[PDB]
Amino acid sequence: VVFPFTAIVGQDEMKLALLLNVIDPKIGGVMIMGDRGTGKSTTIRALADLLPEIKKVTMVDLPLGATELLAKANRGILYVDEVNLLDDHLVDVLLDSAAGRFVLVGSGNPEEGELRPQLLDRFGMHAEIRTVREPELRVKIVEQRTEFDQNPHPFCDQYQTEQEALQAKIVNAQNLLPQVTIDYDYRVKVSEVCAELDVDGLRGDIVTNRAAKALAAFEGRTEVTVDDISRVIVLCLRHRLRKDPLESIDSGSKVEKVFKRVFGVVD
Amino acid sequence: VVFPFTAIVGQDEMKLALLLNVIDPKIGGVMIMGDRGTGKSTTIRALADLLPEIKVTMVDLPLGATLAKANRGILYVDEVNLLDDHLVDVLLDSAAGGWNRFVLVGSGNPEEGELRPQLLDRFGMHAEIRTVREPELRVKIVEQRTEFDQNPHPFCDQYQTEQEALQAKIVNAQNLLPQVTIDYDYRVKVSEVCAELDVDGLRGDIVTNRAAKALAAFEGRTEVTVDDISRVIVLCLRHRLRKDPLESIDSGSKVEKVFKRVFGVV
């Protein structure tokens, strides 16, 4: 038995990136660079255990150096725990196999050679993990972990209806995605943000659109909204920045700043 | 089936470099520097699919150690930054500038190496790819890509007469090139531009002349015009600059400035 996904607290940005990829695997996978390592392996297992069967969904790990495990990985999840030194070309093929049919998930180690700029831009979204800063939230996690370690089944049962409610929303979102439309004016202003961010190519334009539709589908709507784009654009474009080294500005803050201007958002 | 060449939008400078080399392979090949994406590989496949049957053969040569007998074809070196055997690169340049005849195309990695003035001056033209900055154009490109991915054959058919029209223009330009002449005054003012740019050698003089003749041939003319030279001279000379490091001036902008002065464009 694995820690229930709906009980993981304090990782909202990473749970969003994983949920949107389950809804639209053509987003291109998630690169998880949480320099603060905490709840990385167990979150991805919780999400696999949460998905419905169609045979149960299978999660595959990227260990060893097999040249070629994409066999048992179709219509599933593939986790490469340390893709910071995993060959050099095998990474290229997996990023293609995810953008045309599985959920690519990658993790890295800080100070071991930060993702080479040619292989990180091909990742759909870039989710960073920062350890929870709210004190009473940190206490709740610790109190939850020992409470789970002592009595797994009373814990998993406590979240049983919340897991099923989220399980149905994933299915509904997958079913509704074909009807989800984004207005032309929004689709254009998304590209304006990609241009003003000096994104290398059009992949950033493509992922933001696929992500915004997948989020709107998740929330049971068929028209992409300005707020829908707001919640996915940092995940999609912050690792696609081409900023001058003379700038001390946060990448995620640069995308939010440019997004708010182009769309005219007052916070 | 491959994305049609005549549908590629926003890469005009590179499509020009590729078309001129297809018309006169003795130009010396194309070095493609710029955005990694923007389908550099797929444009060259599209151009191969467009050429007439004399089908033309497209060569990969990816990370190898000595695939070079496809004469009157195209050779794409995706990462000629990792041909640490410079001797492989050097022979491919001279053979491209003669019949040993093929269209050399190479791509490289910025900030990794190579690009050494000895390994860059021998490329005929230097085509730079800048990703489109106009928002509605980016949307149009994206809307075209999946439209091709969902229905390849209806997309290729929409461009079928334009593909055949461009195919006839390539053959015509190849056939007309022998009579294309350049005025002596232009030929001298071109050399004045190469000298005033302090280009290393006379190869820049040679490529600019061959490019201007090929462009006029493409457009069904037999007299090279100042506008013909205008459209090729940056492709030919910007990677042949010997500018002082004290200059914050764009290389391509330097070539345009000196061309305008020597020829007197106002």
Added chain:
Amino acid sequence: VVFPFTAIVGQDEMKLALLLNVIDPKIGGVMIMGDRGTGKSTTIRALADLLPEIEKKVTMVDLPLGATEDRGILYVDEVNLLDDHLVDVLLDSAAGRFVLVGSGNPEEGELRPQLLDRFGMHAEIRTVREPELRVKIVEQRTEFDQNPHPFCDQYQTEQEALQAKIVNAQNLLPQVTIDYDYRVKVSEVCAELDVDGLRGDIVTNRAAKALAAFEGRTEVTVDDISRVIVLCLRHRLRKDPLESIDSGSKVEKVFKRVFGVVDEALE
């Protein structure tokens, strides 16, 4: 015969780290970095000899320089060498049973940040600065080398008093509670120090309870947290290199702020 633990003078911070681990080994071990005129080899030997009999005495096992892979105390004299592979395996035996103790050399390879965070506490040894104490250590040391048995007898009842306190602390540890407000303020200190993960939260809580148990109390006190929090978090700092501040001094500074500890200015 071994030098008696209750006779060691001038290592209070390190003796505290060892005693609390003996009381609660799930704290995660002690990393001993510092000076050489102490004898981390004989203080740990003294602590094994001080513990109660296990049925023979508790076994102290030493790991020499050339050491290949292969309820007591394990002393790893040089955990700088013996690459991450061997070091990783030992940390598993700890955490959630033996007291891991490691020592290191300065300038022989800085604390590997990923393998140092997994040590429970970080005790630094500073050689005694009080002149009359330095004389006392030397006079005691030669006095022990000439007549071990007369020396150990001078400290035999004090060894038994400390031995009973250790057992009492272990027996009482299950009833030891920490107030919710303290538990949250401990996590607030961990957050304000930007600690990597929640491991710092857990050992500080386990350490404060073990100290309160050592002193025969069942309620963790602000002062109880004060005496263990530097041992627990100073090697868990992520401070900017632009700061010339001592790590242990940074933990005390943030601890006093979060808990609001100030000196009464008496007339």
Added chain:
Amino acid sequence: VVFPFTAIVGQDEMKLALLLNVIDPKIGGVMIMTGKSTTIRALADLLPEKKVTMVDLPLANRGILYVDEVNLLDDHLVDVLLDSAAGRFVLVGSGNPEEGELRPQLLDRFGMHAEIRTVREPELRVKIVEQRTEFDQNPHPFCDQYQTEQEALQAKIVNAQNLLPQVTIDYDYRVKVSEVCAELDVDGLRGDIVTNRAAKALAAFEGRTEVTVDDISRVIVLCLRHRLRKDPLESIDSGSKVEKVFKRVFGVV
């Protein structure tokens, strides 16, 4: 078949260095820093006598040896070749900037240092290009257009070699040449010797037996510009300093 030597335009300084070495190989070879590989074969094809053979060193008595990249092939191999020269064959070397600038102890041992500057006259650049393609299209009609000029220069080379033993330099000139070497702080007396051997070879080339101030003028930059010991505090061109000191010592208005 090779492009004729007498048709090469715009390389006068390098053609002078090569002709003088062919006349007196004891000068010590040429360091060449637009296609010098064919210029040296053009010179090989031009010499008399079986025909002289030009040898390439990619990894030869009484001929020509061209070391294309004397920056690589470490001092060990380079040292050995310089012995064959000096006080007999024509050593020719070229070098690459940024590839291991020729060690200062290994560059001084070359007789002359000829620099190639690409032609700046527009109508000349056009003429060179038309000459290359005209040669590629019809080599033999090209070589024939230059056949009598090739034979004329071939006779001058033979005569110059035959006349060199009688060529003399005035004592006052020979001393002022040494003053130029001393005022330049040259490493040793090799500059005094090469400038003397070069001035005599040039005078012999022109059918004369007395070295002239003008003869020295035309050879002294080739001989001394790579032998300078100037302070790095000088933004002054090396070749211009040699002319400047030459003009002072000899008194050229």
Added chain:
Amino acid sequence: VVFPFTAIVGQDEMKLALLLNVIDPKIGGVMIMGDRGKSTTIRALADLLPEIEVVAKVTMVDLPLGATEDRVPGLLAKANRGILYVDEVNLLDDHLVDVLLDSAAPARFVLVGSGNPEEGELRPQLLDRFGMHAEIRTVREPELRVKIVEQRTEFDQNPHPFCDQYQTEQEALQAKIVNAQNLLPQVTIDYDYRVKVSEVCAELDVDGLRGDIVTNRAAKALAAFEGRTEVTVDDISRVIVLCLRHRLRKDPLESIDSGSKVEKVFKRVFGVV
């Protein structure tokens, strides 16, 4: 025949370090750093000591560049009741040095080592285990330099006539060494002095208590050498730089001589006028 120890001029600080180790070998050896009469002084000290028996002359053992435990019978045993000179202890780093410091920290000996600057400073963990740090400064008195040279040629020409000229001084110094060894057990250091010695070590931020011990063993040995049984402030003054200057942990912001820093702090703590 070897140059007589009592004739060596201008090495006073090193002669003091060597004599005290001969008097109390538990001091821990001498590290000789400085200008480059080093190999010849130690043999003279070996030649000066009184002739010993097999097991209840003193033997000098050297060590060339090649060690690799080709000493552990070998060479470690020939140093029994003798002296071991390590000519270049800045090379053969790590293990070989650690083993020798252990063998002198079945044969006990006076460890003496010399090193080369710029070719490696002995790793600070293995230099602190040397008892004392004696530096050799070449004599600056001109008329003294002439005497040293003139003594060298005078000895090279007539060894035996030279040794006789110093023979009674050798016997007097030999008797003082034996007496000092015999008197060492009674030599006491006052508690107030013993504490102020530790205060100097602390104010110098010395690594450990080894400096406290060496200064005390050295002060007693010097007082014993001079036929006294009470350590004096001047006794401590003459050994404290030998004992602590290689034990400094000084900030790199200080252009102060290490040996000179010890003198200043010693004068401060003890109140020397």
Added chain:
Amino acid sequence: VVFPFTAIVGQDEMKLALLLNVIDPKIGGVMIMGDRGTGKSTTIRALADLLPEKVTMVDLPLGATEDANRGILYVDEVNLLDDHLVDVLLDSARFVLVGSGNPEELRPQLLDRFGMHAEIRTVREPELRVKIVEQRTEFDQNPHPFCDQYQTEQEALQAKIVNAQNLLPQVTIDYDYRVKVSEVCAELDVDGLRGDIVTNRAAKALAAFEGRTEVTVDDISRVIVLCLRHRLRKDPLESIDSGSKVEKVFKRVFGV
């Protein structure tokens, strides 16, 4: 046959350093740092051909081995093969050690072990440079007429060397001079007493060469830079020539 020693012009400092070592080999050899190409190997051959009895010059190559006396040993590049082979040669010096080196420098610890440091500067007088070259080709064309032109001067110099060697035991230096020599070494911060000894041995050898048995202040003057300039411990904050510093301190101490 080799170019005669007495015909070499413009190398007076190196000819002085070599002659004194031939007279008193215990001086410790010569380090020749001539930043100019002037035929260092052939001067040493010229000096060997000049000595009586015949003589023998060994020339060590770059590739030293693992193993000559009463002769001359020339180490053309004492930079290579320096770890131990250079160390071994300085120990064996009975023969006249001669070494040359190229800048871009021997171990500051292995250069102090050389007796004297003679620098070669290329002749700056124009009419002299011409004469050297004219002498070289004239010798290459007619060796025996050239060597005969210098034959008696070679014999005159040869006899002076024999006389100096034969007279050396009687050569004395005043005590006041000998102390002032040591005072110069002290103010130069010389490493050890090796500089004091060579300056004394060199001054005696020079006085013996000139047929005298009492060292003169000028005798010390002409050798002290050869002996002490490579034994300096001067601050890097000084833009002063090392050889010029020795002259400065010598002039003060002796009062010249």
